[PDB]
Amino acid sequence: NPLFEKRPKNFGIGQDIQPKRDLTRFVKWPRYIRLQRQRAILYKRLKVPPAINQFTQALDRQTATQLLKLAHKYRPETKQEKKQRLLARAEKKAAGKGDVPTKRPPVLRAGVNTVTTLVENKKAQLVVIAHDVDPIELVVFLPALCRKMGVPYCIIKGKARLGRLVHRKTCTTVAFTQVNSEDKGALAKLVEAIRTNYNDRYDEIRRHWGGNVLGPKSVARIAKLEKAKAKELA
Amino acid sequence: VRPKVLMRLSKTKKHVSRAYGGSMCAKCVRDRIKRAFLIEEQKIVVKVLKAQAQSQK
Amino acid sequence: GRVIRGQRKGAGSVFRAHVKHRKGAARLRAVDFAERHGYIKGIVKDIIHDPGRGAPLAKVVFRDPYRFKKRTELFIAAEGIHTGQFVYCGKKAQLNIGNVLPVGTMPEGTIVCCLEEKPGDRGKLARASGNYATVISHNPETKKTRVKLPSGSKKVISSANRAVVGVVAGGGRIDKPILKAGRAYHKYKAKRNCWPRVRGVAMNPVEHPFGGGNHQHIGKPSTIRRDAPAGRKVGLIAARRTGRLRGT
Amino acid sequence: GAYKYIQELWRKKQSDVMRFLLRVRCWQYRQLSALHRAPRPTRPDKARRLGYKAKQGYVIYRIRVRRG
Amino acid sequence: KIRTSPTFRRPKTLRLRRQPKYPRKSAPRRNKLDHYAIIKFPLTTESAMKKIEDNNTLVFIVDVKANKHQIKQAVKKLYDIDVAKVNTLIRPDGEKKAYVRLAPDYDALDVANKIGI
RNA sequence: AGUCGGUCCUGAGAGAUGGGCGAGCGCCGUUCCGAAGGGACGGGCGAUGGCCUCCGUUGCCCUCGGCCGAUCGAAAGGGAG
RNA sequence: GGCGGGGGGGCGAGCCCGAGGGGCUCUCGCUUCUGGCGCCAAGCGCCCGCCCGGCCGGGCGCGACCCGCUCCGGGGACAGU
Ligand SMILES: [Mg+2]
Ligand SMILES: [Mg+2]
Ligand SMILES: [Mg+2]
Ligand SMILES: [Mg+2]
Ligand SMILES: [Mg+2]
Ligand SMILES: [Mg+2]
Ligand SMILES: [Mg+2]
Ligand SMILES: [Mg+2]
Ligand SMILES: [Mg+2]
Ligand SMILES: [Mg+2]
Ligand SMILES: [Mg+2]
Structure with missing residues (x-):
């Protein structure tokens, strides 16, 4: 109430000092950051071939969660219940003389070669x-292999997110088989x-030449170059 | 005396009672008073002169 | 044959610069935010003699706009500055002696010194005692600038670089005849051992390509081109003309 | 199943799909130091037919030499 | 998380105190430099008895790896006599002759009898 | 021998890691292509032991700490008595 | 260590129509008579156990604008190897 001032500093040039501002863009990162930061840029400068920008044309967020709840219930036997199954049914088949209390276990297969055999022989379906x-x-x-065989495939995001339904x-790769x-x-x-x-747009995915996108500093340079060149036109 | 001697002496045999005690030559003290006063008046005069520049112009 | 004198310079054995008592290098302010969008206030504390240089050497105090600390930096003492001047440096510095400011903001005809080759290298061209470049013939677009260096060859440089306005103090140093060997000797004793001008004729066959013979004469034509091997580029290196000058 | 396809795709090392992948990885390694550890072999077929069984005990040191 | 310093300095991460699982030499390597192997000879010469009459100053020969503190510890712990100061020299035949001046109480003559010199 | 000196400190320079080169023992190099501070007082919580009043010991947390690079280099320079 | 874009601003004449108003298109910004000082936040807007509508210590925002793909300039498919 009585006697409290307000002292306004003016933070211009050659006067009252600067604050502790943001300083995120202006910091000398270690060598392992600036590699992994320029590397993501470097895909977006060079023209990628169409065979490798099949990634970033990914399955959207709504569909993949519908797919993960589908993939959650063919989760393979973990080694605690792999232990428990073999210890259980060996005693059950010896007490009741159980010839087959198991018909067929349906599960998704994990790994590339365990997939690539099943795709080459039409043995999996997604x-x-x-x-x-x-x-x-x-x-x-x-x-291209699922194109020539006719098994439908999806490009999905998160190599660890495939790992969570396999405990790894x-x-x-996961192939829905049975x-x-x-x-x-x-x-x-x-x-x-x-x-x-x-699958229907394979002739379209065959010719996506991504990349060739410059930096927004030089892009804003050409956009300003449009304005004066439009000022030639106006 | 020598700098390593100066731990022994008392804290009257190393300075003068004035503000800016053992560091300014007592003529520069009574010039840093006059210079810090006469410039700070000119801050206020120009601030209210240029307030009047923002007034009638 | 033996290794000649000019080849022996390249190891830095006894030919390194006598560099102990030198008081620091002579550069400008590294280009920061304040100088590119305004100017910053600085006071020249005192001006010192840097031995191995005949120019005097300024020492300007400042204030760091980011940390509470005063910074002491070493400009080259351009002519006419005295201790206690308010050298004001930056982009919109007002054109006086000592105020370093870019060449695109000075008008053509401005006699400057210590200007920069390419921007952000802290002062390279026209630093010696009594030299001056003069900004002429601006280019509005394609931000460049013709400058007459103290030779006469108009170099064009990028126009974001700064030049302390005025000539370097120590102008017309060399007008004293040194006039005795000791004063020749002391000048180069503070610099480096570059003094022994023992002529290539007086020395033997082995140690210089000129020597030998029963009379002190060269015999070999002294114009040796720049297609020469090292330890052969002696005499007048690739001279496009020779003899005493004439007119220009 | 796929170690024939890795072999055959890495076989033709002049086509567009691979000449990108070779040229970026040639940039990728040159900014690193002289000797360091790749955590797992970047040609998992080619390590495996030389004696790499993907378990503990086997290290990969990606290593760089100058031509000429 | 607004990093206001334009250097990325190394993060102070946790460091563990060393805990071994097993000893590494099975036993403490005992001190072979006890209060017996320090103080070898008491000196009996002409000058080193003249010290003992008129100066209250016993004279010994001490192993060179000892110091001025351990001589004061060994002379008390064997002879039950106090030490005022020690004054050591590496004698130029190789040993460390050590002049020990005792307390003003204890007598240089009676102790000289009991060690025999 | 605390007070005589070596020890300590930097000078011209000599010298490891990071990094570079090299068939190679290794050389170049001294802040250079670097995640190169392990310290702090104070706030905080958590534990601990004394006389659990209050102290004392760590755990981690908010804050500063140009680390302008290690280390050697004078029995005539610097250096308390 | 404040880069380029987009927003902020009449204490601006700009460049025009035009009645308040319109931004067609610009200007950059809050330090020049003096050998002074300057950091570690004032102030506001908030949420807390506190004392019946009070009292003590804390936390965030704004004060210090938003987003963004290279630290910023300088070259450039040449130089180099
Ligand atoms: Mg001559
Ligand atoms: Mg001569
Ligand atoms: Mg001769
Ligand atoms: Mg010859
Ligand atoms: Mg491993
Ligand atoms: Mg004494
Ligand atoms: Mg090495
Ligand atoms: Mg070396
Ligand atoms: Mg030393
Ligand atoms: Mg001395
Ligand atoms: Mg002394």
Whole structure:
């Protein structure tokens, strides 16, 4: 109330000092940041071939969650219940002389070769490809192979997100092979939607030449160059 | 005396009672008073002169 | 043969610069925010003799706009400055002696010194005692600038670089005949051992390509081109003309 | 299944799909130091037919030499 | 998380105190430099008895790895006599002759009898 | 021998890691292509032990700490008595 | 260590129509008579256990505008190797 001033500093030039401002863009990062920061840029400068920008044409956010709840219930046997199954049924089949209390276990397969055999022999029905396997060689033969075989495939985001339905770090590929009773009706409701983007437009995905995008500093330079060149035209 | 001697002496045998005690030559003190006063008056005069420049112009 | 004198310079064995008592290098302010959008206030504390240089050497105080700290930097003492001047440096610095400011904001005809080759290298051209470049013939677009360096060859430089206005003090130093060997000797004793001008004729066959012979004469034509190997580029290196000058 | 396809895609190392992947990885390594650890082999076929079994004990040191 | 310093300095991360699982030489390597191997000879010469009459100053020969503190510890712990100061020299035949002046109480003559010199 | 000196400090220079080069023992190099501070007082919580009043010891957390690079280099320079 | 874009601003004449008003299109910005000082926030808007509508210590925002793909300039498919 009585005697409190306000002292306004003027933060201009050659006077009252500067504050502790943002300083995120202007900091000397270590060498491992500036590599991994320029590297994401470097895809966006060079013209990528169409065989590797199949990634970033990804399955959208609504569909993949519908696909993950589908993939959550063919989760393979973890080693605690792999332990528990073998210890259980061996005693059950010895007490009741159980010849087959198991008909067939349906599960998705994990790994590339466990997928690539099943795609070459038409043995799987939906193929889920991770986004981020950094040796990209492990990918660019898949979307032409599922094209020539006719098994529908989807490019999805998160190599760890494929790992969470397999109890492993990265998983790269999951092939839905033996569908359940209550789940084939779930499957064809998706494979319609997955052919709708990928398989039908294979002549379009064959010629996506991404990249060749400059920096917004030089892009704003050409946009200002349009204005004066439009001032030639006006 | 020598700088390493100066830990021994008392804190009257090392300075003068004035403000800017052992550092300014007592003529520069009574010139830093006159200079810091006469410039700060000119801050106020120009601020209210240029307030009047923002008034009638 | 033996290794000649001019080849022996390149190891830096006894030919390194006598560099202990030198008082610091002579550069400008590194280009920061304040100088590119305004000017900043600075006071010349005192001006010192930097031995190995005949120019006097200024020492300007400042205030750091980001940390509470005063910074002491070393300009080149251009002519006419005295201790206690308010050198005001930046882009919109008002054109006086000592106020370093870019060449695109001075008019053509401005006699400057310590201007820069390409912007942000802190002062390279026309630094020695009594030299001056003069900005002429601006280019409005394509931000460039013709400058007459103290040779006469109009270099065109990028126009974001700054030049302390005025000539370097120590103008007309060399007008004293040194006139005795000791004063020749002391000048180069503070610099470096570049003094022994022992002529290539007086020395032997081995140690210079001129020497030998029973009479002190060269015999070999002294115009040796720049297609020469090292330890052969002696005499007048690739001279496009020779003899005493005439007119220009 | 796929180690034949990795072999054949890395075989033709002059086509567009691979000449990008070779040229970026040639940029990728040159900014790193002289000797360091790639955590896992970047040609997982080619390490495997030389003796790499992907378990503990086996390290990859990506290493750089000057031509000429 | 607004980093107002234009350097990326190294983050202070956790550091563990060393905890070994097992000893690494099974036993403490005992001190072989006890209060017996320090003080070898008491000196008996002409000058080093003239010290003992008129100066209250016992004279010893001490191993060179000892110092002025351990001589004062060894002379008390063997002879029950106090030490005022020690004055050591590396003698130029190799040993460390150590002049020990005792307290003003204890007598240089009676102690000289009891060690025998 | 605390007070005589070496020790300590930097000078011209000599010298490792980072990095570069090299068939190679290694050389170049001294702030250069660098995640090169392990310290702080104070706030905070958490533990701990004394006389659990209050102190004392760490755990981590908010804040500063140009680290202008290690380290050697004078028995005539600097250096308390 | 404040870069380029987009917003802020009449204490601006700009460049025009035109009645308040319109931004067609610009200007850049809050330091020049003096050998002074300057940092570690004032002030506001808020949410807390506090005392019946009070009292003590804390937290955030704004004060210090939004977004963005290279630290900023300088070259450039040449130089170089
Ligand atoms: Mg001559
Ligand atoms: Mg001569
Ligand atoms: Mg001769
Ligand atoms: Mg010869
Ligand atoms: Mg491993
Ligand atoms: Mg004494
Ligand atoms: Mg090395
Ligand atoms: Mg070396
Ligand atoms: Mg030393
Ligand atoms: Mg001395
Ligand atoms: Mg002394």
